[PDB]
């Protein structure tokens with residue numbers, strides 16, 4: 004029997020810890036107890052910042068990284084931080100995994116990728132009402148990676164930071180809101196601090212579950228087939244779980260914390276998407292500079308959406 008330590012950064016109630024426990028449960032069952040997983044939520048073994056270098060060094064066998072936290076490190080997979088028009092985490096998670104499977108880009112070659120998934124589409128959660136793009140001008144809003152670049156294009160003032168830091172940051176006025184999926188309203192009780200939600204339907208945050216290469220290779224071939232066997236299935240399961248939970252989280256925020264929901268005029272939606280168009284070209288150029296083929300990646304994303 005082997006035991007793998009699985010490091011995670013956010014609290015146990017958030018969906019990246021929920022999916023980790025479900026994955027562990029499937030591993031235990033399909034390997035008939037030949038593999039066990041000891042999980043460490045809340046940064047008790049590795050936090051957001053040292054997660055990648057701590058999995059690669061062996062301080063943890065398995066870890067969960069939010070790709071948007073590591074700008075310039077993932078030139079190919081960061082395409083998934085651009086607005087690709089996904090409305091569900093299930094479809095996004097599934098396409099992300101299939102894209103990774105077919106490309107196996109070199110940026111992730113020093114680790115073994117066990118599975119991937121994404122958040123749901125991002126929205127604005129603010130302390131003060133955002134009813135139009137004008138209200139957003141100058142406003143300090145939390146994002147990370149390309150979601151920050153989207154905020155800047157909209158005229159907001161992006162402040163980049165990992166999730167576990169955001170509550171204190173809101174609570175003390177350093178930021179006026181955040182740009183992400185609405186599950187955090189409940190799971191991290193942002194419904195108490197940010198009383199306003201504005202629909203944006205924007206890019207998702209992509210994640211990878213990563214494993215130390217040596218640890219992966221000391222596993223028997225049949226255990227390895229079980230874990231690879233779980234990859235696509237779990238990507239879909241996570242997105243599915245998250246799409247339902249967003250609905251629950253939001254019903255709970257509205258009818259037990261008075262959260263007000265807003266929607267942008269049709270001309271603001273139009274203008275906002277024109278503003279962000281140039282992020283696709285800046286993404287392609289950064290990718291091309293690091294040796295990847297942005298044309299094939301975009302071709303592949305297109306084909307996989309036409310199919311999920």
Ligand SMILES: N[C@H](Cc1c[nH]c2ccccc12)C(=O)O
Pocket residue numbers: 013017018019069122147165166182183184186187208
């Ligand atoms: N805000 C993004 C993605 C995200 C959405 N929900 C959670 C919950 C816990 C951690 C991250 C996220 C991010 O910071 O990665």
